[PDB]
Enzyme design. Structure first.
Site, PDB file in Angstrom:
ATOM      1  CD  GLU B  72      -3.117  30.619  -5.534  1.00 40.46           C
ATOM      2  OE1 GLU B  72      -3.393  30.126  -6.604  1.00 40.46           O
ATOM      3  OE2 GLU B  72      -3.896  30.666  -4.611  1.00 40.46           O
ATOM      4  CB  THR B 146      -0.264  28.663 -13.832  1.00 38.46           C
ATOM      5  OG1 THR B 146      -0.718  29.998 -13.560  1.00 38.46           O
ATOM      6  CG2 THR B 146       1.166  28.497 -13.345  1.00 38.46           C
ATOM      7  CG  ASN B 207      -9.264  15.497 -12.265  1.00 39.03           C
ATOM      8  OD1 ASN B 207      -8.248  14.812 -12.094  1.00 39.03           O
ATOM      9  ND2 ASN B 207      -9.249  16.786 -12.061  1.00 39.03           N
ATOM     10  CD  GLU B 255      11.866  -0.838 -24.634  1.00 37.41           C
ATOM     11  OE1 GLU B 255      12.909  -0.728 -24.017  1.00 37.41           O
ATOM     12  OE2 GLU B 255      11.712  -1.465 -25.664  1.00 37.41           O
TER      13      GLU B 255
END
Ligand SMILES: Nc1nc2c(ncn2[C@@H]2O[C@H](COP(=O)(O)OP(=O)(O)OP(=O)(O)O)[C@@H](O)[C@H]2O)c(=O)[nH]1
Ligand SMILES: Nc1nc2c(ncn2[C@@H]2O[C@H](COP(=O)(O)OP(=O)(O)O)[C@@H](O)[C@H]2O)c(=O)[nH]1
Ligand SMILES: [Mg+2]
EC number: 3.6.5.-
Lengths: 427, 440
Positions: B72, B146, B207, B255
């Protein structure tokens, strides 16, 4: 994509179209003479969504107005809103359709079908960003249901991969304008679902209620009803017209708003409804919009969704709106009103924050969902389709064109199957 | 080892990347245009690092080795019209055109494959410029396809292309209680297979969890993805800190393979981060690394919607920045072990990788999280993790049982058997992942 063609057909298409461009041109600012008035990047970098940068910077929209009644276009190009449309796009001829779905395309209407495809084909080549075709007409309208339905099949052959958005206006099962309104609607769905990909439900009768209840309007008019539909058409595009935290798309709708194929009917719902005079005593906030979107009184389809059951809702907030303001309010509706949402989805919510805001307001939001009560709107048309024509009345007008009785029977069997699709899939 | 290349895929990925580059330039004194400004010390711009993230320019207009990939145009255009326009080579902003929608069948395939030739060559040219090239750092979302599916293909291509460099992948997950996309379980589950088999180390961010922290720890009345992403950016910068700056106990990118990954699989650490203080509190606050260390185990700082107290302890990592004493963090760890929370499994038997970077933390002006003279980033393979997988798998199950949305994927390059297999692999992981903790 960004470049989308807005096809117009039917006596109501040009009416809703005139009000549509009147609102779109007001957002980014664009005089009817084709003058630029953007300020600036957000109102310049996304002007090709419907217009074209012709010579002298004269912007003109991409719309193919078609109708068998030349007396309709005369009240548009002559008055305001006319310089925008190009005269080459006008395709009109005598006499008319006759308020019938057969003659609307099966015979007389089949003469201009060759001219409409020529203009739409040339524009498709020059437009290097085609996506779909926005159509606006009536489900029972003469030239809208006949010539408009056949046009969807022709475009489907040359543009199969492309989308196909339609804004059909369902009939009013109570205050019908013509007695042959339900009959023409039964044949329009016979080919609509067999070509188009998404269609929105609109009912004029459902608008007079909100116009007198919320807007507090005593004598509505067609000029005002088109503004409400224009707000919906202009809402499902802001993401593509302007940036935002979560830019949606017409394709993303079908991927979510449409669970299974045989289900393209949606229930629109614009909000907030600005009440004339009582708009200053309100507080435009997200919690206030959630209570109005899910309100059965604001539906424009407008079968009561509470009696049925939701499936996949969707909201498109605008203006000063955050992310949690919607995710929180929309989530609460999934708990207190969980009985109205089905469990196998399971998440019955879909957001799409924008950036800009509509002129005159600080924030707006639409509502689109698939409720199991939509079948009720089809039962009213099915009952009147058979109960009225049980004795073979007003049928010689259609059979005289060429269509046989078998063709009209298959249209009823399809609608009867759609009602069963909402129970498989139990209500 | 030296170089690292950043890859942003999809909108969310790009937004987060934006925050990271803002932040990195802040840490090294690099202005929004690059050039330079100045660039500077020891090791501000460099001395090495850089070059680590920024490509040296014979002019000083340093160039972030980042590649933006999207289908997009709008997202990248935002970037191209933002204040950091000048921090990117214009040919690293790989704009698409027709979206993959929502999405995976298009994202990992019918649409995504049409730009990968450009993407991969972009990468190759960049990689040839680089020395060492210890790894790649992916930033994207498992919501829209996407970020999920295209990102997946790209990841795979680099494991095929090199197969020996570190493949980091910061992936954003769907909140268990709420999301913005109905078919998200398909877009997520369908890629668990490939992140499993092609990333060397993944990070899982929710979120919702972050939003909780914003509302509560930072006192934010109205959270924004901008703020959310700023938090994430800081976490990313610490991974990472000792590959650029001097430290008492330097941590190689590899590591974590050595310390956090005990089996070929299992490479899904949680992150946690503190101190998360609002500017209004950072006066009353003033503390030792022992308290900060405690906050790292506190559920309230987890950035992932799961219960670490339920889970058992597998290897972990505590990276510290700023004014930190190595003795004190050893003491802190000892105290934490004595809490007997996240029961230390026998298999470690203790496994606290301590990283000590001298460089103090910093926050950009876009964050209201107070700057501090020290900070902690925590990584962990705690067994709580399979619950996130279970959650998304139930959503997958309900949908798949009815099929429904399957239509949108099968109809464009897919097969229901593929959906079955994706589920099976996820289920297998839930099982194995539990078993290695379940044994003791
Ligand atoms: N932390 C954070 N999460 C984000 C951000 N933008 C989006 N997300 C989350 O990532 C998911 C959204 O992915 P989308 O933006 O729909 O899609 P995409 O992954 O960019 O790719 P497409 O589907 O093809 O557009 C959701 O779960 C969002 O909550 C962001 O800026 N920060
Ligand atoms: N909202 C709305 N409905 C309209 C308008 N014009 C006609 N309608 C509706 O359309 C139906 C009639 O179809 P019509 O548009 O005349 O058909 P056609 O012109 O022969 O294609 C009735 O249900 C009307 O309420 C309009 O401008 N706005
Ligand atoms: Mg995107």
């Amino acid at each position: 994509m960004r470049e989308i063609i807005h096809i117009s057909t039917g006596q109501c298409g040009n009416q809703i179209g005139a009000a549509f461009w009147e609102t779109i041109c007001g957002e980014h600012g664009l005089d009817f003479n084709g003058t630029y008035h953007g300020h600036d990047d957000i109102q310049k970098e996304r002007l090709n969504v419907y217009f074209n940068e012709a010579s002298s910077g004269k912007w003109v929209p991409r719309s193919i107005n078609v109708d068998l009644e030349p007396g309709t276009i005369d009240a548009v190009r002559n008055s305001a809103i006319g310089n925008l449309f190009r005269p080459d796009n006008y395709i009109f001829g005598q006499s008319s359709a006759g308020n019938v779905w057969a003659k609307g395309h099966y015979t007389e209407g089949a003469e201009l079908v060759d001219s409409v495809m020529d203009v739409i084909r040339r524009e498709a080549e020059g437009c290097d960003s085609l996506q779909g075709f926005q159509i606006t007409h009536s489900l029972g309208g003469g030239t809208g249901s006949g010539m408009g339905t056949l046009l969807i099949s022709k475009i489907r052959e040359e543009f199969p991969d492309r989308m196909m958005a339609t804004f059909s206006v369902l009939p009013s099962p109570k205050t019908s304008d013509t007695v042959v309104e339900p009959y023409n609607a039964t044949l329009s769905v016979h080919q609509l679902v067999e070509h188009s990909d998404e269609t929105f439900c609109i009912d004029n009768e459902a608008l007079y209620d909100i116009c007198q209840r919320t807007l507090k309007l005593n004598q509505p008019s067609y000029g005002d009803l088109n503004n409400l539909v224009s707000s919906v058409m202009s809402g499902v595009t802001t993401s593509l017209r302007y940036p935002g935290q979560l830019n949606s798309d017409l394709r993303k709708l079908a991927v979510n708003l449409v669970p299974f194929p045989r289900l393209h009917f949606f229930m629109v719902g614009y909000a907030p409804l600005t009440a004339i005079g009582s708009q200053s005593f309100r507080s435009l906030t997200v919690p206030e919009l959630t209570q109005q979107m899910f309100d059965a009184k604001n539906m424009m389809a407008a079968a009561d969704p509470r009696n049925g059951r939701y499936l996949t809702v969707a909201a498109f907030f605008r203006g000063k709106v955050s992310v949690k303001e919607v995710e929180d309010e929309m989530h609460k509706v999934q708990s207190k009103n969980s009985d109205y949402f089905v469990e196998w989805i399971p998440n019955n919510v879909q957001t799409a924050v924008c950036s800009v805001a509509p002129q005159g307001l600080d924030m707006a939001a639409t509502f689109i969902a698939n409720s199991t009560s939509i079948q009720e709107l089809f039962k009213r048309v099915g009952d009147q389709f058979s109960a009225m024509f049980k004795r073979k009345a007003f049928l010689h007008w259609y059979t005289s064109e060429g269509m046989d009785e078998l063709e009209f029977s298959e249209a009823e069997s399809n609608m009867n199957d759609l009602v069963s699709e909402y129970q498989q899939y139990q209500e | 080892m030296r170089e690292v290349i950043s890859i942003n895929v999809g909108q969310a990925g790009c937004q987060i990347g934006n925050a990271c580059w803002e932040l990195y330039s802040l840490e090294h004194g690099i202005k929004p245009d690059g050039h330079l400004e100045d660039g500077l010390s020891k090791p501000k711009g460099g001395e090495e690092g850089f070059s680590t993230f920024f490509h040296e320019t014979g002019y000083g207009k340093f160039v972030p080795r980042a590649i933006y990939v999207d289908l997009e145009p709008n997202v990248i255009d935002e970037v191209r019209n933002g204040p950091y326009k000048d921090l990117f080579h214009p040919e690293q902003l790989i704009s698409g055109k027709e979206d993959a929608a929502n999405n995976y069948a298009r994202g990992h395939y019918t649409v995504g494959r049409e730009i990968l030739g450009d993407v991969l060559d972009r990468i190759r040219k960049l990689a040839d410029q680089c020395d060492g090239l210890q790894g790649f750092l992916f930033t994207h979302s498992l919501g829209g396809g996407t970020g999920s599916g295209l990102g997946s293909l790209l990841l795979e291509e680099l494991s095929a292309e090199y197969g020996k460099k570190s493949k980091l992948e910061f992936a954003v997950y769907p909140a268990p209680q709420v999301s913005t996309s109905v078919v998200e379980p398909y877009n997520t589950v369908l890629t668990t297979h490939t992140t499993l088999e092609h990333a060397d180390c993944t990070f899982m961010v929710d979120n919702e969890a972050i939003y909780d922290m914003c509302k509560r720890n930072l006192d934010i009345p109205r959270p924004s993805f901008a703020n959310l992403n700023n938090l994430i950016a800081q976490v990313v910068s610490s991974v990472t800190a000792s590959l650029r700056f001097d430290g008492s106990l330097n941590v190689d990118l590899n590591e974590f393979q050595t310390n956090l990954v005990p089996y070929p699989r299992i490479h899904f650490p949680l992150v946690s981060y503190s101190p998360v203080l609002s500017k209004s509190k950072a006066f009353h606050e003033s503390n030792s690394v022992s308290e900060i260390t405690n906050a790292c185990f506190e559920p309230g700082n987890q950035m992932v919607k799961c219960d670490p107290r339920d889970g058992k302890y597998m290897a972990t990592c505590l990276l510290y920045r700023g004014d930190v004493v190595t003795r004190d963090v050893q003491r802190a760890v000892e105290q934490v072990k004595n809490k007997k929370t996240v029961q230390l499994v026998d298999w470690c038997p203790t496994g606290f990788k301590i990283g000590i970077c001298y460089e103090p933390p910093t926050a950009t002006p876009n964050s209201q999280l107070a700057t501090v003279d020290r900070a902690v980033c925590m990584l962990s393979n705690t067994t709580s993790i399979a619950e996130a997988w279970k959650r998304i798998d139930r959503k997958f199950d309900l949908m798949y049982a009815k099929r429904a949305f399957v239509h949108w994927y099968v109809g464009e390059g897919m097969e229901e058997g593929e959906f079955t297999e994706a589920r099976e692999d996820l289920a297998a992981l839930e099982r194995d992942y539990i078993e290695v903790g379940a044994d003791s």
